[PDB]
Structures are given as C-alpha cells and as structure tokens.
Amino acid sequence: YPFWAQQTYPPTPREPTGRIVCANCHLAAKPAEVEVPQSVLPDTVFKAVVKIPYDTKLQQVAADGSKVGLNVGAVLMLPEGFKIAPEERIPEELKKEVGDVYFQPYKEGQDNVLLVGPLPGEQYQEIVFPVLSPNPTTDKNIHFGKYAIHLGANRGRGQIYPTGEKSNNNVFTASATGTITKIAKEEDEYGNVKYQVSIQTDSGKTVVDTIPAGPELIVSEGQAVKAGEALTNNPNVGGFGQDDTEIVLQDPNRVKWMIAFICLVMLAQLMLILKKKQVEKVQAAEMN
Amino acid sequence: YPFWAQQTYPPTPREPTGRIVCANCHLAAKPAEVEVPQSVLPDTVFKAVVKIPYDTKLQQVAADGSKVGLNVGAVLMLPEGFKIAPEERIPEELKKEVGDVYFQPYKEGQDNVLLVGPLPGEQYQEIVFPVLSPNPTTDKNIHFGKYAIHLGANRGRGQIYPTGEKSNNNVFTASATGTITKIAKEEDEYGNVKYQVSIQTDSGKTVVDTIPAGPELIVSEGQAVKAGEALTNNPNVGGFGQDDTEIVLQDPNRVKWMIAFICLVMLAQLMLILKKKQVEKVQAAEMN
Amino acid sequence: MILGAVFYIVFIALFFGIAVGIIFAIKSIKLI
Amino acid sequence: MILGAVFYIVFIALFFGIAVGIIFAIKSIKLI
Amino acid sequence: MTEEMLYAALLSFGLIFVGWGLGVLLLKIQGA
Amino acid sequence: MTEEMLYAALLSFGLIFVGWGLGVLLLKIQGA
C-alpha cells in the first residue's frame, strides 16, 4: 500500500531511472493514465485526473483465501509547490467528483507528491486531484515554464510484505526436483487452509513445500516437473501502472504579447500582398 | 639579508604580484640582470649569470657610522626541479668562476629557489650559478617547454630590521613642526655617536628626535621646516633590483624532426621552381 | 473545443474583414 | 655565433649545391 | 496526453485547406 | 635577455638580402 512505500522508501517514491518503488512488490503490470490540462495560469485551481482502469466485475484472492473485490492506490507527483487546492477554493462540482479521498504527502514538506489510497475499486476507477498552481510573481523560486508530472498507480493487492515475505497473491515454484508424494490440506484452529506438498527419490530428496490458500493448484498427482515449478497457477489478477506527462505553467503576459505580435504580423503580411496587387497594375500598363 | 627573507617570509620570496619580499626593507632601486641561455637540453649543466652592478669604488654608511665597502645578496628562482649542478659535474673553468658561494635553498625541498649572499661587493659583481636541467623522460612531472626564471638581487645594506625598527642607512624626518633648539652629540661608553635634536614654540611643542650616526645633517641652526622633514640627507648608496626571463627546456627530438621537415620543404620548393622553369620553356614554343 | 472554434471563426473573420474592406477603400480612392 | 655562421654557410651552400647541380643534370639530359 | 496529438494532426492537416480556400476566395472577391 | 632581440632584428633584416642575392645569383647561373 501507498503507505508502506513511504514506510520502506522514505525520501522518495521514484528512483533515478524513473521507476517508482511501488513496482517492487506489486509485480503485475496494468496501464495507468494521468491527464491534467496543457496549460495552467498561475494561482489556479485545476483538475488532475488519475486513471486506473481494471475490469470492474471480477475478483482477486484475499488474505486467507476468501475471494474479494479490490482496491486502487497510487502516488502522483506534481512539479514544484503545486499542492492540493485549499478547500475553500475547490469550487463546487469539483468538490463532488473528488469525493472522499485522502491526499497524504509523501514526507513533511513535500506537498507535491501525494499518496492516495487504498480506495475501493469501483468509484475510484478514475481519481480526481483538485490542485492549485504556484505563482511565480510571489513565490520567488517558482518560474514560469513547462514541467513534468509523474504518476505510478496500482490496483489490487501485492506480492511482498514490507517485512520481506511473500503474500499469497502470487504463485509457488517447487524447491528441488523429483516425484511428488503428498497433497495434504491443513487448517489449524487459526491462520487458515494450507495445501502441504513435497517431492523426492533422486539424491537427498525429502524437502517440504507449503503453499498458502487461494492460488489454485493445477499440478496434480505423481509427477516431477523440475527446479522450482508450475505447481500453483496465477492467483494475481492485480497490478501496477506508470505515466509521465508535461504541464505548462503559463504567464498570461507572454500569451498577451504573443497575440499582439502575431496581429502585428498578419497585418504586415496583408499589407504587402496589398502592395503587390497595386504593382501588378502599374505593370499592366507596361506589356501594352 | 637573504636569510631574513626566509626568516620573515617563509613559504616564498615572491608575492602574487611578482614583487619579491626583499624590496620591503631594501628601499633603494638599482638594476639587476639575469642571463641564462635561450635553450637547454635535458639533463645538462649550464651557466646562469646573475648581474648586480654598482659603482665599485665608493662606500656606504655602516652600523655605528664607520664608512665601509659593501655587499651583494640576491634570491634567484629557477623553474621546477632545476637545481644547482651536483659538483662532480660542474666542469672545470666553471668551478672557477663560480667561486666560493653558498647556494642555500629557500625551504627544505625547494632546490630551485636559491638564496645567495652576503657576498662581498667586488668579486661578486656578477655571480654565477652552475645549474642542471631536469629530465622529463625520467622525472615524470617535468615536461619539455618554456619556463620562467626570476631574480631579485640587492646590493648594500638595508632600511629595516627584521625586528621592525629603522637602520641608519636611511634619513630621518622631524616629528612635529617648529623652531629647533639643540644639536647635542652623545657617545655613551657604548652604542656610539648620537646627534640629539628637537623643535618647538607653536602649540604643545617640546618633542625629542634622536638620529643615529652616519647620515649627514644638512639642516642647521634656528629653523622650523614642517611635518617631519629634510633634516638628515640620504645616507643610502644601496639598493634593490628585479628581473624576469624566459628559458626553453628543449627536446632534441623536436629539434631533429623540425630540421628534417624543413629540408623536406626547401626541397619541395626548389623542385617546384625547377618545374616552373621547364614550363617557361614549353611556353616559348607557344609565342612563336 | 467549442470556444476556440468560435474565437477562431471571429478572429479570421475579423481579419478577412479588414482584408476585403481595405482592398476596396484602397481600390476606390483609386490606389489600386 | 661562430658556429651558426659556419653551419649556416654550409647548410645553404649545400642546398645551393643541389639547386645548381640538379638544374644542369636536369638541363643536360634535356628535361629543361 | 494522446489527444493533444490528435488535435494537432487534425488541424495541421485541416487548417491548410481553410487558408487555401480562404485565399482563393479572396481571389474571386477581387478577380484574377 | 635584450641581445636575443638584437640578433633577431639584425638577421630578420640581413638575411633577406642574402636570400635575395642568392636567388638573383641563381638567376644568372641560368640566364633570364
């Protein structure tokens, strides 16, 4: 979860390569988008939409085994002193689509990298960030310009605990290599079910191989398929996205003179072509 | 003296401006030269001549007053691991003109800045340094090239003690401003003679003004010439020079190919002019 | 989109105006 | 000085040699 | 992020035409 | 240190002449 990102990787969610640490545990890949407009003006509330699509009507494996809906997380990282819009200022239908979300900052001070989630899958198909542009006229190391924004979003539960052990939403190899002896089925007054399998004859050969509850097995009886294998099948309907995107923090002034300089041009251009015409005419008095 | 240079200014005799600290005490200026050849080859003994001219037959003022001959000093500073030639290697008429000189290094390690003197004026009119070029084929941060050498030489005794008080080979002002009362003449069982003068009436006015022995006075009786004045005359027939000079530490190889590449040229040039001639001739068959 | 589309129409429009207009003015005080 | 002066004389000399020489060789096997 | 490209394509292409027509049209309004 | 300049002057100047004469002389030895 977004929090254990923070928890495990304190000063940043992204490495120098652009990865985003999240992808260390969430092993699946599924697409993530991130729209925001092409330009904002300074001091402005504006929307940024995170997208995290997954096929709504299907289910993943849970802790113990059940077979439950699922949840989107996501860290987004806005450019320098962008921050979530202060709330008197979000206006209205926006309040509404933002919903009930928690925009938590990746470390004290960095308001511009926000963790978000675990939200529940079905209303958080798309996730809105109401955000507000800095103002380079008043914060004196914010300049106008074009800047990057990076999302990495994930949806559905992951493959490794922040503690270092495997979850059950992956798929177990087979330790050594030989002929299997026993598909037991544990369920001790707690920590539920437990398919207990093991291999043999060859050389040494009695190694034991438990495998949590909620994968399948699709490897049955007899057998010996080699060095850590098939046995499980793939529980994991989950997984992780990434997106980068540009945004220009524009200054209306630049826009204003630009527009002026253009008309100044268009005008000149017609004015020449006008001249030319007036010459095509003094010329017609020079063939005859 | 060269030694007190060292003594007062340890890590170098020259400041970033190119002065040479010596000139802080020796206040006179008289010319100093320094010749060395235009090129040396590597690993070579060669001469460097310091010059320190002064008019041999005249005399300066001494400690107490006497009226004695005088002495040349000088720090020279050769470029990187140049050093004084090792003595088996100086050869012969050179041993001879080098004479009886002490080439003392400005600090442990720097064999390439040498103090020299106090020598006595009349044989040390010119002072020879037998020196030996480094060898960039064997000392691996010595390169061929053109390098600077700087002398500053001085001759005859100076104006300030390394302790900070005046010597007697300068010329005393007059403290305040008024009418002088007394030309006394001390000589207490030691530290000899002592013309004792003083001024007055004006405002405050009794200040006392001793003046060592061996300047003149040329300010006599009555008087009042103002804010620290005339009184003494100029004892100091002494003083200090400076010289800089370039030297190339050449590599005969460069010279060898150069000479080859030239003849290669001269040859080509005659060879063209030869051709031209042979054409001026096929041409003469084309006017007639 | 809808906004550009307008501003856009008006903007060309407007210059297209000046264009045509100033031929004529320019034609009938006989300069062209 | 005395040394250059010589080496110098010989050096030009020598080329001056080749110059003149090779005109002639070059003249009388009739190339010039 | 891929419909900025679309628009751009789209109008880089379309707008040509418009300018085209528009000048051609001028052209008429004056008579070649 | 000021008689490097002397020589140089001196021969920059002189040597011209020599080359001069020397070529002129060639010139004779072949006949214009």
Next chain:
Amino acid sequence: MVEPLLDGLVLGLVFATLGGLFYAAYQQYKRPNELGG
C-alpha cells in the same frame, strides 16, 4: 521522452503535403504543357 504536439504537427503536414503534391502532379498532368514546354 515522446513529444505529442509535434508528432501531430508532423503527420499532419507530412500527409497534407504528399496530398497537394500528387494533387498538383495531376492538375498538371491533365492541363498539359502551356506556352510550349
């Protein structure tokens, strides 16, 4: 890093020009000649 706006800029004009290019080759290859080659 990919650059959207430009990429439309490109295909846009690329095609548009390939377009008019062949379209004049035609206009021209059908009105033929004029003034005598």
Next chain:
Amino acid sequence: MVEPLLDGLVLGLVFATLGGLFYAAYQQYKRPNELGG
C-alpha cells in the same frame, strides 16, 4: 610580459620592407612606363 625574439622579428622586417618598398618605387619611377601605361 615583453617578447624579445618577436620584437626583433618585427623591426627587422618592418624596416627591411619600408626599405625595398621605396627602393622599388624608385627603380620604377626611373625606368618609367614600359609597354605603354
């Protein structure tokens, strides 16, 4: 920093040329004309 070798290089040629320059102006202003201006 002053540079001896070059400085001779200079006067050397400067004078030497001023020299031959006036000397041809003369050679020439005394053989006059040839071929007809």
Next chain:
Amino acid sequence: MATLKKPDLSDPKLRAKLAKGMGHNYYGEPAWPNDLLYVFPVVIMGTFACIVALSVLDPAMVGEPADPFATPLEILPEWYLYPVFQILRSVPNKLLGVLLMASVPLGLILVPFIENVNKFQNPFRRPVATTIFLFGTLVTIWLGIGATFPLDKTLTLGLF
C-alpha cells in the same frame, strides 16, 4: 493579367537551354518585385510567427540532471530519428542495422542515377517510382510509430 512573359522560343540561347534541361527561369512572372520584394517576407514572417507562437504556448522542458548510473526507461531519441531506431531494435544483428542505417543516405544518393533511365518529372507519368516511393514513405511512418510503442506490440503495431 497575373503578370507574365512567354518563353521567347525564337532565342537560340534560351532554346539551347530548354534544350539542356533548363531554360526555365527565363519565362514567367518576373521574380523582382513580384515574388522577392512582396511574397518572400510573407513566407519568412509567417514562418517566424508560427515558431514564436509554438515556442510561447508550448516552451522547452529542462529534464533531470544526468545520472551515469541510471538508465532512464522510456528513452527515445528525437522523432525524425524514430524510424531508424525502430530498425536498430528489431534486428538482433548488431553489425547489420548499422549498415541498414547507413543505407538510408547511400541509397538516397543512388536515386537519381537509377531513376535517370528515363526522364519524366511528373509521377503520374512514372508508375514504378511513385510506387517504391509510396511504398517506402509508408514503411517509414509505420516503422516510426513503431517506437511510440512497447517493445513488441511494436511491428505488429498491436493489431496482429
């Protein structure tokens, strides 16, 4: 009207040119005033305007500073480089693609030798070009788009 001048085909000199592949700038609208003086500046000024405009509304990014230990995933070259880089990366032969690059130049030179077999300009009159051109112009674009994509829905461009 336009403004005009008819080849004057009685002129030995012009003729001898038309002849050679070229008297071509001798007949037509005069190029002083007419096309330099008047329309030039239009093209130049417009060109400038667009580029300024572009530059103002969608300026230069500055990206991260360079890290000798990181390859950034998502590294493309500039765009006009894609096509090649496409190739370069669907061609397990190192040495090969490099030749394959080089050919774009070499080949491109070869063209007017080859295509000189005859002599028409208009591509309508010259079927075999207009194809291998259309052909290649197309592969180029398609190889282009090819890196806008991920490794291997790459050539298939993700539709087969």
Next chain:
Amino acid sequence: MATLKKPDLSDPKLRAKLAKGMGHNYYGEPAWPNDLLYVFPVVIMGTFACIVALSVLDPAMVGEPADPFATPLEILPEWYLYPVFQILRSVPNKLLGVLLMASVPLGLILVPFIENVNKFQNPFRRPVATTIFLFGTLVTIWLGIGATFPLDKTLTLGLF
C-alpha cells in the same frame, strides 16, 4: 623570355578599362601555371616552415594563474598594441586617449578620400604623403618602444 603578353591596346574593352583605373590584369605573365600552380605553394610552404620552426625552437609559455587580488607589475599588452598603450598612458585625460585610440581606425579610413586630390601611385611623385607617412610610421615605432620602457624615461625614451 620570362613568359609574356603585351597589353593589346587596340582593344576597346581593355582600353575602356585602362581608362577607369584598371585593365591591369590583362597584360603580363599568365597567372595559371606560372604564378598559382608553381610559386604559390612556395610562398605558402615557406610561410608554414618559418612559423613551425619558430614554434618548435621558441614555444608558448603558460604563465601564472589569474589572481583577482594581484596586479602583476610588468603588465603589457601584446606588442602591436604598445603604441596605443603608450598614448593611453602619457595623457592624463581619460576620455581623451580613448578618442585618440579610435582615431587610428577613423583616420585610417579617411586617407583615401583626402590622398585622392591627385592620382599618383608612386610616392616619389607624391611628397606630401611620403612625409606625413614617414613622419607617422616613425612616431609609431617611437611611441612603441616607449612602453618597452619605464614610466618616464618613457617619451624622452631616455635621452633628454
């Protein structure tokens, strides 16, 4: 022999040129082979040789590194700058010398306007130049030498 070609003074065209200040490269030794092909390379190659030679026997120094707090005493400019720097420093008027510098250029331009009063080349035939030239060429040198010297045996150049 040399090799030669006499102005052909019957040619209206050459004449009309001689006329203007210039048919001058129409008569003489032919410039192909003769002077380009053969002697050029001589001049170029010699030029190179000397400079290589110079460069080898008396190479570039590298001097001390720059110190913002030290002015080095003994600082001159390059040589061809001396003359000016001389001036610059015997002219207590700041603003003046700067004009005085500037004039070398401006004045030098002025010359062919002025000296156009007549029309002879040869300076023998043109006394008044050959003087103010000789004159100035001399002051120049002398002002030059002037900084090879110390502040003020400077103009007197140390002999009065």
Next chain:
Amino acid sequence: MANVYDWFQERLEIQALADDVTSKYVPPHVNIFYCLGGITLTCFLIQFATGFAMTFYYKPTVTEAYASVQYIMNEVSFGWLIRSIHRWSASMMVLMMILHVFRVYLTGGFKKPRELTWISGVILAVITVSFGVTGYSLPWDQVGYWAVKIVSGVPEAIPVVGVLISDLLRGGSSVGQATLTRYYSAHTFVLPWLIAVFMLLHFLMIRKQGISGPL
C-alpha cells in the same frame, strides 16, 4: 546629395547585380511547395541567430552545462524565448526539409541536368541531423546524456576502424568531459561551417541552373 548610386556604380558595376536579379523569371509550374526549400533555410537562419545568442550563456562543461541551461530558461531576460525558439526551429528545419525532399522527388527536380544538387541536398540532410543529435545533448541532463552514450557506441560495430572512430567521437573510451567538449566544438564550430560550405554549393548550382521544369 552628389550621386551615391553612381559612386558605387563607377567602381563596382553594381548594376550587373540588379540586372542579374531582375532578369530572372518564375515559370508557372512553380507552385507553393517550391517554398519548402527557402523555408528550411529560414528555419536555419533562425537557428544561427538563436544559437549564437546561447553561446553567451551556455557552459560546455560537465559541471556547468546543465545549470546554465537553467539560468538561460529561468533568469536571463527572454531566456525561455530564445531557447524554446532554438528548440522548435530545430524541429521545423528537420521537418520542412523532409517536406522539400518530397517536393523535389515528386517533381524529379533531381534529374539529369541537376543530379549534383540532389547529392549536396543529401549531405545537407546528414549535417542537419547531426546539428540535431549533438545539440540535444548539450544540456547534459538524463535524456541527453544517454543519447551520447548509445550513438557513440554505434561506430564500434564497424571492424577495423570503428573503435578508433568512436574514441574521436567521444574523446576517450567512455562518454565524459571530453565528450561534451567535442560535442560542443561540433555543434558550434564544425557543423555550422560545414553547413555553410554545403548550402553554398546547393544554392550556387540552383542559381546557375535555374529551377527544374514543368510536369
């Protein structure tokens, strides 16, 4: 006055210049796309001006390069304009030039009398792309530092020379300060001179031979 045109006219024969310009005509198969050329050129002059403007602030040194670009953006007056224009106009030149390749080819402007022109065109083409690859990595940021890293490896595939070529390219065995050094000399001193000598032929021929003919 005291007639100016004359003055020149006497001396230089200034006329011939005009009589030469004004005596040239435009054939009617010469339609809009015969601007592609001059546009690509226009683009390039814009490069040269904005480019040289940046040589007053850019540091081509591994510590200062990247930083300095930021200064330009950021703190120099119109830094962003200047630089951004450089950036867009690169692209417009690489493109307008592809567009002009198209009009030449489907006009067979490259055909007999003119094959030289086309050849030079292609070299211009290669030099432009190199203007391109080199410029791109002077900011010595993440994307540009890997481009030098890849494209300098490429030469190495080639068998005899190829390593040696790569070392010239990058100034040692591995991309480093020599590389940005050499890359700068390239983008700002070699390429421009090269690009001019060859636009010089490309225009000289064209002037001499006049535009291809009609379809």
Next chain:
Amino acid sequence: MANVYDWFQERLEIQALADDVTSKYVPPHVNIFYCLGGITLTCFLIQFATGFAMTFYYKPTVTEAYASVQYIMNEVSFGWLIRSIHRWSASMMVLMMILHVFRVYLTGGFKKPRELTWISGVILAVITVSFGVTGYSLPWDQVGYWAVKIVSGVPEAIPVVGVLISDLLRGGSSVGQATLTRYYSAHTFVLPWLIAVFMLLHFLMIRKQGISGPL
C-alpha cells in the same frame, strides 16, 4: 573511364571556371611585396586550423580554462605544437598585415577606382586585432586576466552608452565567468564569421577590379 570532365561540363559549365582563371595575367610592377596580402591570409587559415583543433580540448570556464591549456601543452599529443603555432601565427598575421598596409599605401593601391577595398581592409584590421585581444585572455592566467580587466574598462569613458557597452562586453559590471564566456563566443564564433564576410568583400572586389596599376 566514360568521360568525367564532360559529365560536369554538361551540367555545370565547369569550363568558364578555368577559362576565367587562366585568362588573368600578372602585370610586371607586381613585385614580391604583392605577397604580403596572401601571406596574411595564409597565416590566417593556419589560425583557423590550429584554432579549431584547440576547441577539442579547451575549457571556457573559469575553473577549467587555465588547467586545460596546460593539458594541451603538456599531455595532448603535439599539444605544444598546435598551441605554439596558434600563438606565433597570431603574431605573424598581425604583422604580415601591417606589412601589406605599407605595400598598399606606398603603391596607392587604395586610390580611386578601389577606395572600398581599403575601407574593408581596415575593418579586417580591426577584427584581426580583436581576434588578438580576446584570444590572449582565454588561458585565464595572470596576464590575460588583467587585460580583460583594463580593456573592458575602456568603453566606460564614453558618456551615454559606454557603461552599457562595457556590461555587454563583460557580461556584468565586473570581469567574471560571464566574461570568459562572452570572450569565448567572440573569439570562436563571432569573429570568425565576421572575419569571413569581410575577407569575402576584400577578395570579391579585388577579383572584380584587378590589381592596382604600375608606378
């Protein structure tokens, strides 16, 4: 074979080039010193080659400039040759050019038909001296760092503009990194282009008008 000269001759009219060269003559008042020009030129090409060689090692940055020159001398193969040649040939160009000023003047080659040539000559003159002052201080050592310090103060005497001019010159109020920056752009990108446009006129005129006449 399959005749090469022809090939060109067909297309370009390559002949005219030769017929133009070979139809030019040398008058006999054209004596040795009418080499002064071409020599000054030769000198300059040597500059351009050795110069650009140094742009592959020189750092124009206040930390690395000085150090790098030392690398060139010192550690690059023939560094010393290259650099030393740059250094001597600067001087030979400033001089051979003074020598050519003399032959022009005491030939009145600058007279009527030619006053333009002389004018351009003088500008070449100024640009050369600037090649000069700027180059001299790129090693950013003691002597060169004071030259920028003095010559940049000079402009400041002038009343209205003059301060403003000095700041362009040096890139701030005081000599610093902008200065070496600007000075580099100058010596390696502005001056050379300037020097070429103006040797371009100086040679174009001369070709058009032929050498001055006899004495």
Next chain:
Amino acid sequence: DVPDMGRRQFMNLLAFGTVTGVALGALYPLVKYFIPPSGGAVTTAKDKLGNNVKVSKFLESHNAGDRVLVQGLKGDPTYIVVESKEAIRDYGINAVCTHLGCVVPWNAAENKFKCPCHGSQYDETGKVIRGPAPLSLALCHATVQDDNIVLTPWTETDFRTGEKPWWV
C-alpha cells in the same frame, strides 16, 4: 487609372513601415536578452580564499601600519587598514584604480598607493595624487559587529574632499 508614383509611395510606406514593426518587435527581446541580468537585483568582509576575516586573529596576526586586502562590496577588493594603536580604521579604501582599474598596491616606503598599470598614484587614505586616474579611491564603513567585519556603503560626503562622493 494607373496609380501615380505618389501613391505607390503611399502603399510603400504602409507595407514597408508595417514590416519594420515586425522587425523591431522581434529585435527587442533579442536585445534585452544580451543585456546581462541585474545582479544588484533585490555586508561581511572576505579572505583571498573567501573566509569571513574573523576580526580577532586578524587583529592578532597582522601588525600596525599593515594594510591588507579583503573582498569589499561588489566584492571588489578592499584594503582594510590596521591602525597604529591597533583596532580598525572606520572606513576601508576600495582598491581598484580609477583609471581602467588594476588593483592598486600600498607602497609601504613612499606611504602611497601606485597603479602598476599605467601609472596613477594615491595618498594614505584615497585622495588621487597622480593620473591617468580621474577621481580618487572609493571608501566604506568598517565596523566590528558579531566579530566579522561589516562594510556599509559610504553614503555621507567626501571627508577627504568636502563635496559629493563621486561613486554614490
């Protein structure tokens, strides 16, 4: 019917004038570009290396009549004078000559600064004794404050000349 010179020249003036508008338009930012960023945009002495002369073992290890350089303001080197019953002098003497500005040395003998560049001389406090230097050396206020040295513009008049400070 065919328009008369005088009306071409009208239309000339219009396009050719409006074309300039474009040209200067484009020129303007380009010029402003080249005009360096103002550093004075929107204090404590410093050592050759660049360290805050800590006043106390600067009292200590220099002497009386000594005079030693120190990044002044605009970081110009400024000579701070150790006085002859030693604490500091009020004002510091800003070290650039006034000619084209080499850094001027204290000649300890002739009690006098002299520009090694082309010659100018100046007295024991500033006042311009020879030229080519126009005015005399700049000044400034030195305090002991927190035990850095703290240099302040010298705003008041020319204690050494009466009327207005030339430089402020």
Next chain:
Amino acid sequence: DVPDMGRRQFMNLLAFGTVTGVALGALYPLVKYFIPPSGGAVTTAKDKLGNNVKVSKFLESHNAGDRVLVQGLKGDPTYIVVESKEAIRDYGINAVCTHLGCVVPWNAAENKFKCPCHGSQYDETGKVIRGPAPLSLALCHATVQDDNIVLTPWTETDFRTGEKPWWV
C-alpha cells in the same frame, strides 16, 4: 628541344610528389593530435557520490538478494551481489549492455537484467539471454581486502560459457 609530355610528367611527379611529402608531414601530428591521450597510460570499489564502499556497513545496511551498483573498473558501473547467507559473491557483474551500452537494471521479479534501451535481457550472473546484445555482461574479481572492495581484471575463462572471456 621542347621537352615531351612524358618528361613534363616526370618533373610533375617530382614537385607534385615532393609537395605531398610536405603535406602529409604536416598532417601527421595533426591527426595524432585529435586521437585522445591514452588513459590506460601506466582496484578499489566506489559509491554513486564516489566513496570507497566500506565493506562492513555495506554488509550491514543492504540485504540478501539485493544487488547494488558501484564504480567498477574503467569505473564502469558494476553491480556487486549481496548473496543469500551474506558475505560477497567472488565476481562482480559489469553493468553496461553490450548492445550500445545503457546501464542494465536488475529486474528483481523475473530474476533477470533488462536493457531499457532497445531490449536485450541477461540472466542471474551475466549470460546473454535476449538481444540486440551480442555477448553477455562482463565480470570481475571481488575480494574483501583492507575492508574496501578490491576488483581485479577477470583474466581466467568464462565460468558461465567455457571458452575465452570476450572482453579480455
């Protein structure tokens, strides 16, 4: 009497040939000039910043199955593998791909390195699993010595391929 083509062509050959001699003469050093100085002219691991990985709180603060970069030799980045009963692996895996050489990442899931540049993949030790990369990743010897890490050329054969090390 007038010399025959054939003897012009002799004299051509002589001057024109000797003129080349000059030209290549001058060319030669000029070329050698541009060919960079050999750095291999006439060892200890290093951190991103540039510090000598002190083996002991590098054991300490990375894990088991971790694999972290480190200036290898020619200072190429080299991945040093922390092994699953933790001291160090003998050899280090030199990190540049073998294609045009981006620095290749350990994909911890698929236990496999993959070049982000154009695609190539490589296994848990080196051996080249996809292309465009020709050979597999370089290697080298890692020891604990003085408690720096000390990397040595891997001179012996391709433990992962049998015959000769491609790179040495």
Next chain:
Amino acid sequence: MEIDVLGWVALLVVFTWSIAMVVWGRNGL
C-alpha cells in the same frame, strides 16, 4: 483561463492567414 485559448487560436490564425495570404498573393496553389 482561456486567454490560454485565445492563446492557441492565435497560432492557428497565423498558420491560416499565412497560407491564405500566400495563395491570394500569388494566385496561389
């Protein structure tokens, strides 16, 4: 917050007008 939009239109309009102007100007293709 759509001077921003007026913004781009301004580009579109020169692009247009420029073509437009060129064709008008030379009876254009």
Next chain:
Amino acid sequence: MEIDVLGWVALLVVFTWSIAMVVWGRNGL
C-alpha cells in the same frame, strides 16, 4: 648542445631559401 644551434640555423635557412626560391622563381624583386 648545439643541435640547439643547428636548431635555429634551420629556420634562418628556410627564411633565406624561401626568398631565394621566390625571386629565382619569378625573376624576382
């Protein structure tokens, strides 16, 4: 220690010969 001298002479000799060659070559001034 006078290849050093042969050294300079070599310069002197090209200077000479070059002039020399040029004059010979063009019946010279």
